[model samples]
Structure formats: C-alpha cells, structure tokens
Target: SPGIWQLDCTHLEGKVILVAVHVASGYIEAEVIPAETGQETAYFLLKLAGRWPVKTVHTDNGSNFTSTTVKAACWWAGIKQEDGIPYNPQSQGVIESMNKELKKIIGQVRDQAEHLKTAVQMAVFIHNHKRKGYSAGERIVDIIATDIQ
Candidate 1:
C-alpha cells in the first residue's frame, strides 16, 4: 500500500517543530528539532519511515526540503518527493491547516524549553484522537485503525 504525506516545519517559542501529516487519515506526527537545517529535516523524514511507511512526501520548495541532504534521505528511504506550487498556499492546505492548529494548541504552553517537548506530544495526541468534519465523526486514529484492518 502507498501512503502519502505532507511535511512542514514550524517555529514556536524558540522550538523548531518538524511535522508530517497523513493525507488520507489526517494523522499528525511531529518532533521538536534542535534546528531547521537540511540534516535535521532529512533525519526527521527518515524517522517517519520507521513509524509509518512513506511512499510520497509533499512539501514546499523550501531550501530545507530542496537540499541535497533531503534528496539523499528520500533515496535511501525509498520515498518519492513532490513539490508544491510556489506562492500558492492552497497546494499545501493540509499541512498549513495542521501547522496553524498545532501552534494554537502548543503555543498555550509555558515558554520553557522543558515544557515544549511534552506540549508538542500532547498536541499531536489530541489532534490525532479528535474528530474532524471529513471523518464523519471518526477520529484520525479511528480512521487509521480502519485502514489497517
């Protein structure tokens, strides 16, 4: 089976968050990275392949995603890359919406580095378990569970 994912990064309260969302289930996975370099981004993408299989990754043409490091990572992981249209937010709406809501949720935490990791973890859990309009009352986890069956 092929899995499609969208990738993006967000900086919140001095923490850089690497985010990936499943296009079908709307399930979100994110990590607080030390920096936003191509090496860090490439590592995150490779990490995702261990948790859930990644066939295609869609992202904007930011230098982080466009860098040779990420390209090599994709090649090593057997994942393909898809670039979003420049200057068009609509092309990456899924990840854009997720980043917006992730900030709203995680941004409420205290401005301490120790709290950021836990806050992001909690936010990802809440987002994955919560119901959305497209899910017909099923949460993201529920949808994913059905898919696995």
Candidate 2:
C-alpha cells in the first residue's frame, strides 16, 4: 500500500487502500484507508487489523510512515519500524507478491463488486485461509499461543 495503486478495474475508481502483511506468515490485512501523508501508522494498522502486537515493521520511507504520529503509533504498539530502501518494491518480496495476487483477485471480481470494501475484505480473508505452507491463520494462532506460554 505505497501511496495508492490506481486500479484498472470494472467496478472501482478513486478507491484508496492500505495493506499490511505478516512477513513470515503470509497473513495480510487490507483496508480502504486514507492513501497518503503523515498518520498513526501503528494505530491505523492496529485498529484496522484488530490491534494486535507486532514486533517490527518494514516500510518504505514515506512521510505517511515516518511522521511523528506514525512513530508514536509504532512506539505504542510495541513495533520497531525499519524504513526500507527507497523505490524498491523488491526489498519486500512477500508483500509485492501478495500485491500481485491481490491485483488478480480484484480484477476477477471487480464487476460483481457492490462495494469496494466488501470486495477487498473477501479477497483478504480468502487469501489468509487458502495459502500453502505456513498459512496466515495458522501462524497467527501459533505465534500468539506461544506468546501466552
């Protein structure tokens, strides 16, 4: 979710989105949030993604991710944000791959989408459950369960 990706789809135009993926688990959180500028990156993701605990965050050096609000957000959420290399989508390969998959999903169902948010929510939920190897739901339960021990 770097600034906003313009969609060449059937039922959508001018819709902004944000995405958060768990690097190890293939877990993804996608939402219709404000696209750019300084914000509470931590709480934004927390509230949108159910306010979970995150250890480190890797994000491009966007002002939206670097602002004081975002810094505070990360601090309060117990996340250590690492600014990623600039203009480098490949630096975060997992997220990039997920983005590609998201593109495919959105295109497949865009015409039937009654609302942008509903379509995206379904896509993310489906992705979380269907991936191979260490799935999102599986890893999430594993991580939090271990944390409780």
Candidate 3:
C-alpha cells in the first residue's frame, strides 16, 4: 500500500517546526529546525523515510518545499513530491489543524521543556495516543499497525 503524507511548517520562538502527518493513520512526525532551509527540510525528509515507508510527500508551494535541494532529496529517496497550489489551506487542513493543537500544547509546557524538540515530542506523544473520531476509538498507534502490516 502506498503511504501518502502531508507536510507543513509552523514557527515557534523564531525557530522552524516541520510537521509531517501520515494521511491514513493521522500519525504525526514533527521536528524543530533552526530555520526553514531546504537543506534542513531535506534532512528531515530522509529521517522520516528511515522511520516509515514514505511513498509520496504532499506539501504547499513553499520555497523550502520547492527548492532544488529538497527536489534532489526527493529524487534520491525515490519519493514523489507534490507541491500543491499556493493560497490553498484546505489541501493541508489536517496537518494545519494538528499544528494548531501542537502549538497550544507546547505553549502550556514551554517553560518546563528544556528543548523545543522535547516539547514537540510531548505534544505528539499525546496527540498520537489520544483516540481520534476517525480511528473509531483506536489510537494512532493501533491504526498505524494495520497500515504498516
């Protein structure tokens, strides 16, 4: 089965937060980068591939997603990169909504979180374990097992 993922970027404390949500299971992988450079994004892309079977990456037409470096990374990884049209938030609505929740969660624990990545991990841990309506009371991990198998 082909695994399609949506990518989005949000900012926190002047840092870049790159989020990739598996469309099927709603499992999220998020990372905090110093900036939104293509190099950083490409590195994260490869990291994601190592963790999961990345077949296609769907992202908005941001320069970070359109840069040659990112294109090269996609080619090297043999993953299709779909640069969706600009000014279209609906295409990435799931990821966008998730990001909103992540921001709020991170905000609440920002003071205790020593690193931004730690904060993101905590937020994602909670997000993934929580039962989502689409999952029929199953957590993301349980739903993902069906897909990964």
Candidate 4:
C-alpha cells in the first residue's frame, strides 16, 4: 500500500509522488502530482502500464488503490489487483521500505514544503543509485531486459 509522504510534518500541503517498484529487481518509477487521489493513482499506473507489463499490483485497503475506477484501469491494461493485509506493513514490504527511504531523503532536506517537490524527484535517483551493485540507469536497463523479454 502507498503511504502518504510524511517527510516534514502534518498540515503541510504539497505535491505527492506515487512510486512504483519492480519487486523483483528493486527498480522504481515515481511521478510527482499535486495530490493523492484515486484518479491520480489510476492515471499513474495506466500511464506506465504500457511500458511495463504489470502482472499484479499489491496494495493496502486504501480506497485509492481499491476504488472501482482503479480496478477498471488495471483491468483495461490486463493487470491484476490485489490488496495487502490491513495495518500490516510487512505484507507490502517493497514499497513500504522504498517509501521510508524516500521520506528519509526528504527529511534531510532544509525546508519542508518549500523543497519537498524537488527533493522527492531527486530522492528517487538518490535512493536508486544506492542499490546493491547497479546505478539507476543500469538497474532500469536490467529491469526492462529481464521483465520485458
């Protein structure tokens, strides 16, 4: 399940980034948006569904990922939708860990909402490049090659 960006503090309005990770290789795709809504969620996934053949998407019981509209979007793209256990982060470990890392990166930035937008965008690269043995570019190429073929 996707968690809200709690990088700085509550009551701070900001753009949210929906990040998707290829669980197999830890490859990630993230997009910045003004808000987190079911519409945005569906659009985000549908937009990239063509690039990656999503077999199944696992998320928590949040309405954003469980709404009928999102289901339709995934169905249209021939992707399966699954719900992880409620109140259990372990079930959705991949995105949960990545989200934690993203928030940590953002937290390290000087300002809260002021630099949050850019910090998140850069954080993706910062997080990805720290992976096991591959940089972001190499990891993405490896992900595409392994998954698309």
Candidate 5:
C-alpha cells in the first residue's frame, strides 16, 4: 500500500513525462521537459517526492528506465522499482488509458491550444471522482485513498 509508482513517457514536440503514484487514487504529478532520459526521469522523480512520502515505483524496460541515473535515484530514495514484463502492454494499462482519455478531451478543445493543461486537470478530476467501478455487483470507489492524517 506504499512506495508504488509508475513511470511513463509522452511527447509534445519537446517531451511530456509523467510519474503516476497510486493509480486507484489517481494521485499523480507530471512535468514537461526537453528530453526523456534516465537523468531527467530521476530529476522529476526526486522533485515529485519533495516533502512527500514515497515507497515503490513501477515502469517498463525502456532505455531511460534502465539508466544508471534512474537506478541511483531509486537507491537514494530507498524505493523499489518494478519493471513490467516485456511485450505486456497491459502492465501500463492505467497510464495508457489516461493517455487516450487525455487525447480525446484535448482534441475536443478546438480553439484552445492551452486546453491540454485544462484537459489534464479535468480528466483527472473526472477519473477520480465521477467514474465508478463495478465490483461484486456493487459500485465502489476504486480510486486509491491517501492518508490525510
């Protein structure tokens, strides 16, 4: 229930990086940087955990993922990183679903080039609150719950 995170990459002329922690809660933070590499990824990961509690991380085996810098950052944070099995896209399902939803919403904002930001915020809001999950014939709050205490 702690130390679990997922690292994934996206592009926007430059690059868009996301480090999602706790998919159920949809608690995530992201950054738009110039490149996608281990060093940059590590930087964001550290920045994301600034003054926050972090325990684990999950990601796919990309070049940036296997970088020395990334490994060093994980070691420094005392966080464990789980690499998804090769060829198994389902491993990154949550973020992949997020990507599709983001694109769909952003695409609908015809005149708003800045809509991406709004889209991301709104989409995340809906995903965490408005969406419902069916479990055992009952709708449940499937989003991750964080300890506010």
Candidate 6:
C-alpha cells in the first residue's frame, strides 16, 4: 500500500510550527520548532516511527526531507521514501483531500473560539474512527484488521 505525507507550516498567534500527518489513518503528530530544518524533520520522523510502524513515507522535495537526517532515519527504519515530482498535485492527492476535509470541518467550529480546541479534538476522533477511505471502502479499523492476522 502507498502512504502519503505532507509537510505544512502553520502560523497561530505569530508562532509558526511544522506538522506532519499520515493520510491513511488521520494519525497526526506535530512539532513546534523555530524552523523546518533537517533536524526537525528527523525528530518528527523518529517520533512518528516510534509510535507507528511506517513502511513507506512520501513527501515533497523540501529542504527538510532532503536533509541527511531524514535520509538516515528512513534508512534506519527500512522504509522507502518517495519524493513528489515538481508541480505534480496528483502525486500528493491524499494529503490534499485531507486538507479539504479538515478545513470544511474546522471552519464550521471556528466561531466557537473558546471551544475550538475541544471541537478539533472531537472532530479528529470522529474522523479517525468513522471515516472510510474510498479505496478501503470501509472504516480503517476494519481494513487494518485484515493486515494484522
């Protein structure tokens, strides 16, 4: 199976951070560092791989992923790293679709500023448990079971 990942820089209250997520499972992990340098990239990969068994990783040719740190982590994990071709949106379609879904759901809850965080928490929970990818045609929990035993 192919796995897609995206690197994004989001600014909230003048603070910028890097976030990476697994497109298939909606498993998200983020880092708040001064920059999106290679070191930060390596840290993110290590954190993610520690929590999940990553077989493959896909990202654009950002300076972060191209760094030696990221390359070494991929090598150590025995995971294949795929870089998207320049200007090819189709190659990163999973993250793209996820972005749209996130925006649609998040936008509606933004008005409740005080409860935004709680809303996002609930939304992510529902998305991961209830959502079904078109390719899978069933909840991810169901599909993942097939691979386990």
Output the number of the TM-score-best candidate: 3
The 0-to-1 C-alpha lDDT of every candidate, in the order given, reads 0.75, 0.59, 0.76, 0.61, 0.57, 0.58
RMSD of 1: 3.6
Q: After superposition, how far is residue 134 of candidate 1 from its true place, in Å?
A: 8.5
TM-score of each: 0.78, 0.73, 0.81, 0.68, 0.66, 0.62
A best-first ranking of the candidates according to their TM-score comes to: 3, 1, 2, 4, 5, 6
State residue 58's C-alpha deviation in candidate 3, in Å.
1.0
Better of 4 and 6 by lDDT: 4
Q: 5-92 in candidate 4: lDDT tens per residue? A: 1111111236566776665556566777776677777787687677766777764346755688878887888777776443565535
Q: Candidate 1's residue-wise lDDT over 32-105, tens digit each? A: 88778888878888998887778888764468557999899899999897775535556467567778888887
Q: Residue 113: error of model 4 in Å?
A: 10
Model 5 stretches astray by more than 4 angstroms: 86-90, 108-149
Q: How many clashes would you count in candidate 2? A: 1
> Which regions of candidate 3 fall more than 4 Å away from where they truly are?
86-89, 133-149
Lowest summed lDDT across 10 adjacent residues in model 4 is found at 1-10
lDDT of 2 by residue, 35-97 (tens): 544463445544633455666666644664557777776676666666655356554565566
Superpose all Cα atoms of candidate 5 onto the true structure and report the RMSD in Å to 1 decimal: 5.1
Query: Could you say which candidate leads in lDDT?
Result: 3
Clashes of each: 0, 1, 0, 0, 6, 0
lDDT of 3 by residue, 73-124 (tens): 8888888988755356665565567778989999887777889889888877
Off by over 4 Å in 6: 2-9, 86-97, 100-140
